Amino acid sequence: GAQVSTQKTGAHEIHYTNINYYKDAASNSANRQDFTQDPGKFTEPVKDIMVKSLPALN
Amino acid sequence: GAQVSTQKTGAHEIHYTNINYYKDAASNSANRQDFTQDPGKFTEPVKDIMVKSLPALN
Amino acid sequence: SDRVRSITLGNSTITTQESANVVVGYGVWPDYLSDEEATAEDQPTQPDVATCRFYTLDSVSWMKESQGWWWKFPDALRDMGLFGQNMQYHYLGRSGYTIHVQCNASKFHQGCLLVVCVPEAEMGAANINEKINREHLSNGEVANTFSGTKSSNTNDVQQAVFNAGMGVAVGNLTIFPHQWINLRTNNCATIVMPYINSVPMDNMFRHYNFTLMIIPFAKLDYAAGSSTYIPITVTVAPMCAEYNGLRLAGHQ
Amino acid sequence: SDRVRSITLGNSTITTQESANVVVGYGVWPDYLSDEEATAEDQPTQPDVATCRFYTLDSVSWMKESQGWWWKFPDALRDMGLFGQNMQYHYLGRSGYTIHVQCNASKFHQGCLLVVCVPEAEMGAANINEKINREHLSNGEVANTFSGTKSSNTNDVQQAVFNAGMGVAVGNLTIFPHQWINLRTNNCATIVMPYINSVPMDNMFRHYNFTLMIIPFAKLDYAAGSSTYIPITVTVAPMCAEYNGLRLAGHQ
Amino acid sequence: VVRVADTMPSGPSNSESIPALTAAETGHTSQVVPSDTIQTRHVRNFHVRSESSVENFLSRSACVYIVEYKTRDDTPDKMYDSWVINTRQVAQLRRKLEFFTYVRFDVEVTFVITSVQDDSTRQNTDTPALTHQIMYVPPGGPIPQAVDDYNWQTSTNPSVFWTEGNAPPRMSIPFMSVGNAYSNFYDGWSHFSQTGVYGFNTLNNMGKLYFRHVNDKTISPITSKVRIYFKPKHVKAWVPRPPRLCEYTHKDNVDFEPKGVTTSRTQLTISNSTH
Amino acid sequence: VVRVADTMPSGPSNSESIPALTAAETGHTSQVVPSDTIQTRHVRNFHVRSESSVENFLSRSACVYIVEYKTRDDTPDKMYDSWVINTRQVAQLRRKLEFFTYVRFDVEVTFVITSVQDDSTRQNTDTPALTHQIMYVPPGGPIPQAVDDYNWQTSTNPSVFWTEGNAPPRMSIPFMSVGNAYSNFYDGWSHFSQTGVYGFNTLNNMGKLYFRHVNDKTISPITSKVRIYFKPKHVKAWVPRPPRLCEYTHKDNVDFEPKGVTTSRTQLTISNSTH
Amino acid sequence: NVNSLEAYRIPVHSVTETGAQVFGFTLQPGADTVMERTLLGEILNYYANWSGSIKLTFMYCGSAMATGKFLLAYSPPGAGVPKNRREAMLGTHIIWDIGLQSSCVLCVPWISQTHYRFVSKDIYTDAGFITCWYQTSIVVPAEVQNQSVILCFVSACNDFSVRLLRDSPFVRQTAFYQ
Amino acid sequence: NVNSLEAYRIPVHSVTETGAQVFGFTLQPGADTVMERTLLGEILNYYANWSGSIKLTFMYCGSAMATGKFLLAYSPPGAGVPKNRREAMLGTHIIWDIGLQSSCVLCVPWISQTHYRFVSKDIYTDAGFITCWYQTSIVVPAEVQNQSVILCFVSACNDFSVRLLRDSPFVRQTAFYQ
Ligand SMILES: CCCCCCCCCCCCC/C=C/[C@H](O)[C@H](N)CO
Ligand SMILES: CCCCCCCCCCCCC/C=C/[C@H](O)[C@H](N)CO
Numbered sequence A, B: 001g002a003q004v005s006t007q008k009t010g011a012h013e014i015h016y017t018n019i020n021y022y023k024d025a026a027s028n029s030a031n032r033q034d035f036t037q038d039p040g041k042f043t044e045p046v047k048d049i050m051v052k053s054l055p056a057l058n
Numbered sequence C, D: 001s002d003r004v005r006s007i008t009l010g011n012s013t014i015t016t017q018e019s020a021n022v023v024v025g026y027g028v029w030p031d032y033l034s035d036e037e038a039t040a041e042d043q044p045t046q047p048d049v050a051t052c053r054f055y056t057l058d059s060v061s062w063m064k065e066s067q068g069w070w071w072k073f074p075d076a077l078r079d080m081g082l083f084g085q086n087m088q089y090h091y092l093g094r095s096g097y098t099i100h101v102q103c104n105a106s107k108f109h110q111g112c113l114l115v116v117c118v119p120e121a122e123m124g125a126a127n128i129n130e131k132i133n134r135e136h137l138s139n140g141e142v143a144n145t146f147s148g149t150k151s152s153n154t155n156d157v158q159q160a161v162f163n164a165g166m167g168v169a170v171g172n173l174t175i176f177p178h179q180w181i182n183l184r185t186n187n188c189a190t191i192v193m194p195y196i197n198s199v200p201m202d203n204m205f206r207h208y209n210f211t212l213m214i215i216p217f218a219k220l221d222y223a224a225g226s227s228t229y230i231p232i233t234v235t236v237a238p239m240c241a242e243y244n245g246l247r248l249a250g251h252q
Numbered sequence E, F: 001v002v003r004v005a006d007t008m009p010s011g012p013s014n015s016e017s018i019p020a021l022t023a024a025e026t027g028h029t030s031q032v033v034p035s036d037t038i039q040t041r042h043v044r045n046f047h048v049r050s051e052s053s054v055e056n057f058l059s060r061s062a063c064v065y066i067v068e069y070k071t072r073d074d075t076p077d078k079m080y081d082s083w084v085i086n087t088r089q090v091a092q093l094r095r096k097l098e099f100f101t102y103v104r105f106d107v108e109v110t111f112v113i114t115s116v117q118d119d120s121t122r123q124n125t126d127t128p129a130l131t132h133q134i135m136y137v138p139p140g141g142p143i144p145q146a147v148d149d150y151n152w153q154t155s156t157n158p159s160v161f162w163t164e165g166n167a168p169p170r171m172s173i174p175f176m177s178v179g180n181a182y183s184n185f186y187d188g189w190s191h192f193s194q195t196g197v198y199g200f201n202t203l204n205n206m207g208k209l210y211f212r213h214v215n216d217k218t219i220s221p222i223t224s225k226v227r228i229y230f231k232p233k234h235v236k237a238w239v240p241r242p243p244r245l246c247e248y249t250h251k252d253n254v255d256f257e258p259k260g261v262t263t264s265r266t267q268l269t270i271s272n273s274t275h
Numbered sequence G, H: 001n002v003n004s005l006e007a008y009r010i011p012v013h014s015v016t017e018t019g020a021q022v023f024g025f026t027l028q029p030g031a032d033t034v035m036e037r038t039l040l041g042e043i044l045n046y047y048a049n050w051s052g053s054i055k056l057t058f059m060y061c062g063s064a065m066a067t068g069k070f071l072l073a074y075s076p077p078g079a080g081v082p083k084n085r086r087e088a089m090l091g092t093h094i095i096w097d098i099g100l101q102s103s104c105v106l107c108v109p110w111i112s113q114t115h116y117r118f119v120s121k122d123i124y125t126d127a128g129f130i131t132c133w134y135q136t137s138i139v140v141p142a143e144v145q146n147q148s149v150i151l152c153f154v155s156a157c158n159d160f161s162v163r164l165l166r167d168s169p170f171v172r173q174t175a176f177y178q
Helices: C081-087 D081-089 E054-058 E091-097 F054-058 F090-097 G039-044 H038-046
Strands: A003-005 A014-020 B001-004 B017-018 C005-008 C014-018 C022-024 C070-071 C090-102 C110-119 C176-182 C190-192 C210-221 C233-246 D005-008 D011-018 D023-024 D069-072 D090-102 D110-119 D176-183 D188-193 D208-223 D233-246 E013-015 E062-071 E081-086 E100-116 E131-137 E159-163 E170-173 E208-213 E222-230 E232-240 F062-069 F083-084 F101-118 F129-139 F160-161 F168-171 F208-213 F222-230 F232-240 G010-012 G022-024 G048-053 G054-060 G067-073 G092-097 G103-108 G127-138 G148-156 H010-012 H021-027 H049-051 H054-060 H067-077 H095-097 H103-108 H130-137 H148-156
Touching: C081 C090, C081 D081, C110 C190, C110 H148, C176 C190, C210 C233, C210 H148, D011 F160, D081 D090, D081 D233, D090 D110, D090 G092, D110 G148, D176 D188, D176 H021, D208 D233, D208 G022, E054 E091, E054 E232, E062 E081, E062 E091, E062 E208, E100 E159, E131 E222, E208 E222, E232 G054, F054 F090, F054 F232, F062 F208, F101 F160, F168 H067, F208 F222, F222 H038, G010 G022, G039 G148, G054 G067, G067 G103, H010 H021, H038 H148, H054 H067, H067 H103
Parallel strands: C022 C190, D011 G092, D023 D188
Antiparallel strands: A003 A014, B001 B017, C005 C014, C070 C210, C090 C190, C090 C233, C110 C176, C110 C210, D005 D011, D005 E013, D069 D208, D090 D188, D090 D233, D110 D176, D110 D208, D233 G127, E062 E222, E081 E208, E100 E170, E100 E222, E100 E232, E131 E159, E131 E208, F062 F222, F083 F208, F101 F168, F101 F222, F101 F232, F129 F160, F129 F208, G010 G148, G022 G127, G054 G103, G054 G148, G067 G092, G067 G127, H010 H148, H021 H130, H054 H103, H054 H148, H067 H095, H067 H130
């Protein structure tokens, strides 16, 4: 029941092993490898979107 | 001799690993994941069952 | 051009000719509550014409020394038709909104408003260990007013523009769904605001969902022959309003 | 057997065990207004749970000398929840009804009621060239009472049982949708009543749609040790209620 | 993964069906759903009856008794202690077990031992680490009558040794009854002539524990107090029964003083007044 | 593995395209890249927004409170201590949580316990190792009112026992709210008539901790001070908001004295002079 | 009346006018004094959160020759307690006619802000009021007793749950049980 | 001016000759007093290293009949502060013409020795100077106010990063919050 995933290494130059030991999901370690984002709801939060080269309020 | 089963998670959004270490079944952990029931022997404990829309003592 | 916008909700229509755009929340458009996110078990009430329509609040006067204004918004519509009546007869409410603010001038007037729509604007007190009365947080369709300096009234909100009643930097208050009314380009500011809460439905008297804030950064200024009286008019329309838990009328 | 009946409309349920049947109007079941018979042009309001539900009126006491009672029925529900509020905020209303009347006794009591549901029961006056006040035709959920003889009160209906307030034979008053509450077989009388008018929608304050009448033909009678107090309870549920022409609250 | 029942939508009804009319005189609990009386919507419900099962309700450690003994005394009986094993001297675990009539479970026993220096004139000592001994005697075995008695050898009896400062001692115990379930209630006598003792005291017969210090006579008195924690696991339970209203009195019988059924209201109808 | 955006090369331009001209009045943040205004080269950029995520920003242990209690006293209330659980008495973890309005996280709780011998005339003792007990009471449970009180039995309440000198005690705690998120701010009242208390104090309702010494009355006073460390893990966060400018005053409200927006400069234009 | 069996009897009889209140209590299974020591109140007093619907069953224990009607109303909070039968029929109710079938069911619908209430008392999760009114009076013949007795029942529906373990506030011991 | 809302207003008007300095500050998002308490300054004050480009947006809040031009210059360090408009247009700049489109963007390009700067102040990673100058004056017609107000905005680009966690130097408490 082991899971293998890559480590946080640098660029231009791994594979740790994890087994869960407790019956509950509140015992698991922190999910410190989710690096995704989406600033489309804070920047650009408008109807009838803008095309960045048009005068846009033309 | 390992056994893999799902964890207690919430809804709308696992797989712990267990190995038994002792020769006796009285050493095992608590069976805290049996969620079945049957209240047909406490509610509805009658002969000639009732159909819930009929007057039932008609 | 895209400066002309028309909005129809019910038997009420707004036509604008110097609009800018429409900000829609955090990208989410107001919709009804699904069966998976539901908690209550009984049939809701969806009036959909007699409730979802534009209501016009009081106009406020904008002098050269004006500081700002705020309205609490499930409570400013307490006495606005069948929306307010449906608030009075049910226990659980849930709606989104459309906030349209009117202010007009000429090409010789200058000034710049910031229209913010802030969720959970829990406000501070003028005296720190003192309880605020409800007539100062909200007054219905009548606006409450910020002050320029440190206010210290009894049972009142700390009224200073540079802390927005919340203890934050007023310049950083643009993280929320906002627009500007700049008097050389704009005439109006439309903000579509969805339902935001920690629970799927809530009571519309015990809770304050959000707070509209209209704060003039660039102060109003004009010459010695121009018009002095410049009003500011707020119009609100509930969207996808539904109601749950019918009982007698009251709030206690 | 078919004597047990259960009726569910909203969050209110009536279970009866000595019912007789259910009379449905003139065969027509209450439905909404189609697009071909429509007159008004705007979207109606269909609450459908917060409006269509059973409301309980006042209980009336039935002595041995009781003569009869009447209720006008778009007006007896003026102060009954969101039905009465939706009456107060709109101009045009349209609904059908379900009229359930409760009266119980024992197997030692005797008596017989006639529960009639009369459309357009335009009533006469006690003094012939005199105007009737509105407090005597209707009183809301409080019943008005017939008299045994020729009544001659001021600004009042001619209250005689043998003319039913309309100048007709009271025995011929069974041409209307009716049932009987006979105390040796019955316990209740359910009448489903559709919308009957000369126009597709109408105002629910200026007009009286119908009049429930409960008249005891066989007088109430019992022995010297039985129970004296026998109430009569009327419960009403609007059906397929829709509303048109929203404006401010009032009636003038 | 067993969910609770969904709420199904309904509309208006007018028929001879009567879900709300029933007869409770048949000992039958009506199966009426809220979609049988009023108009409901569709609610997809994700609640789980998880933390209400008989396993999760009973499998919690509970203090059953406190055992006190010393390390030097004038009388030898206060230097050791004993306890006849029952679960009926603390009211919380007793009332949690007495929801049912018969039970079948394995036990998980945990001891928590603390020592306190007694008041004396020579408190300025340097005491090495105390070691305790807990001997279990199955019913019928020989009984130690002193701390230096030779019945503390544990050649066949189960025992556990604990040095001060470690983790609490823990061992597992299987189902030990001579019948098919631990009988919580026994309505009957001990003798066939219907005399003797009346109650569950005939069916206890579980053995008894013994406690002492493995160290010898110290030069200052120290009072040890060890607390026994039972944990019922692998649980089966039969034929439920109402919880006890009345306060307990003793361990051996079920006797009581009569108690009122609930708290009084002083009125019978609610109002919007001072209620 | 999510990199930041590369910088793309550009050349001279002369056209009717205007990336630098926009309108900030629409509530829109312009998406202008440096290759839209000036001539840039090609830069292959390998930076990762890794240590700025909401998981890595909040999942650090933070002291929330200090709890002090003794081992022998004349008054019984100073031999034990209690704490109503909040995260709003230390400003660092409070200000780190108040970036958002609603949060959903599991908690990882760590206690650090230190003992100091109090000043007395009989400091020359030999004290055996102190054992501490930390009992958590869910909201509504019974409250201990002495150190020898019988509500310290922990038959159903969660507890932890620690002997002096070991590792700090650590346990995990799931998401415990009755709603869908821990509401950091609640703009509303407690009563339906809009009276009562105003703020987030209605929605705390988390229970409270209890602290004592498992050992009995010692012959010299020792002051224990235990520090509670929360660690928010499994983090989700919604609807951000500006950080607080002003210094806090209390735990139950949000009130303040007004503070200036930033530090003054005394001039408005820079120069190569004494700036 | 708690130190007897009269606490279970709901008195009911012939009235003078109509429309009076029979009884009334607050929907708190585990905090209300009415359903505190009841079986649902006991099991819910071993928990801290609860959720789901509640059935109330009413048995008429009078005579076979007596008739009557009642209004069994549930009212969600936000207003107060309904003060007459006019305010009581604006909520969830049922008219029960007493005949051959001797028992009725008021199934209290789960109507809540959150998913769970609290078993103990707080202002935030308040649930409402159970009240009962005279629809029509109790008409009885001669040589039959007038005053009769209603019995009441409670249980949970099939969508019911409990969440947080705690000790019951009913257990109070001082010493051991020697 | 910090104890008011006047701290956000950049005063601008008609000049006498030309080419004077409007405002000026140093590019230190988290160490400069100008953008210290700003949102980028707060989040960067929870970090110790930063990297990437910075957008500065300037909104003209004057009247529709007023015109003007400005020079929005960025100057990398190595020299000092530019002392006139002649020294300011030798670096990265933009001429902004005020018309219908009311806001301009000066996008400060990432020009650095290393990959990261420091958020606190040191001589090694110094970043440069933001300055603003009059290209042409503000010409306004009659019966229109002369003195107007510029507002300024800041945010980060899509290649921005922060690296090292630390506590913010803004939190200062003495006792607990009883
Ligand atoms: C020293 C090592 C062995 C430790 C022995 C400790 C306890 C031995 C007895 C097992 C526990 C059974 C306790 C009683 C169980 C049932 O609840 C009762 N018979 C009544 O139901
Ligand atoms: C002794 C074993 C159990 C230890 C119990 C320690 C803490 C129990 C409560 C869990 C911690 C929740 C703390 C509060 C979380 C949220 O930040 C607040 N509600 C406000 O957001």
